[PDB]
Amino acid sequence: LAKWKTAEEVAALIRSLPVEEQPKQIIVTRKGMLDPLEVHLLDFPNIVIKGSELQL
Amino acid sequence: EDPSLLEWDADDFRIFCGDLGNEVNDDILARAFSRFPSFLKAKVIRDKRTGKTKGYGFVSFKDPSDYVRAMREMNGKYVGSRPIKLRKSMWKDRNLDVVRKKQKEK
Amino acid sequence: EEPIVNRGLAAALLLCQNKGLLKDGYKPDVKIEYVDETGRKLTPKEAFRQLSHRFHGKGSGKMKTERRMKKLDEEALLKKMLGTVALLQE
RNA sequence: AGCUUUGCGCAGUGGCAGUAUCGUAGCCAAUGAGGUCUAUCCGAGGCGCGAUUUGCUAAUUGAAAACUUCCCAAUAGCCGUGACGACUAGUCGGCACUGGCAAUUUUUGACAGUCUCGAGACUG
16 A cells, blocks of 8 residues: 555656656666556556666 | 627526437427526527537526526426536637637746 | 767767668569648557548547647647756755 | 633635545434443443535547537749741740759859957868
């Protein structure tokens, strides 16, 4: 539930950012956080959740 | 342009009467007497040169409070072959689009 | 890390590659598509919508026209191109 | 004279929202519903019903997802070539180009970069 809340908060912060400034790609370090990210903001699919194995 | 609202500009309460039957309430759509002027200066719009109605039709009552009360009391009531409802009219020409563009991004 | 070298086309191509910007008897040179009159290549869903509109002989409505115009304007604005305010407010 | 208690109703804010909010219309209930409790003690809720209603916006599918007509059609450069007209086989204006116009003097560009106090210098 905490992870889902974090993903929802990330999606809401993306929505707070303008659509013209929406990140076209969303690199997530957490492996399992991509599916909740896509589920939370499926209404805004302009962002591609690309994997970044090498964690910065 | 569409020179149509010139015969309906009365500062009245205009509502959307649509989603009814093609022939349902073809000529008596304003025959109702829920208020004093009924749907004054209002009729059912249609697709010309086809003998068919395109759904939405004019519904303009000259009394705002009476219009609201009638719409609330007669929302989706039995109207001919297809009970239709009422909703607020758009009345949004380019004179509204310019002001909306001015007030949106600024 | 390769800058645009003057009087050179290999540097810009390298930067675009690093940034990810890249019977008579004959073979048929045929490649057909469905690109709208505005030049934009219609999506297969959009192409099917256009074909069905042509078959039905009916076009988009007023609200559909408004939505299409808004979407096209937003796409054009995005294709055209808040850090300074966040740096000054910090 | 200034403040304030139960706070009330208005308006703003914060939070909560299935266990909750409320009607509860069925019932008991300030003339006590309930116990290990408080127990020679306290006195106000509980059983069951039903929802969490007001609007706007984007998107989504579809052929069309709705607010007063509609798909349609013409409008609102040069050299040579063939006659027409003129001037002494030659010269000129206009009519359309049946061929061409990326090879030194005009249009398919010898252009671009750098430095210094409108001007000068260096390189490819």
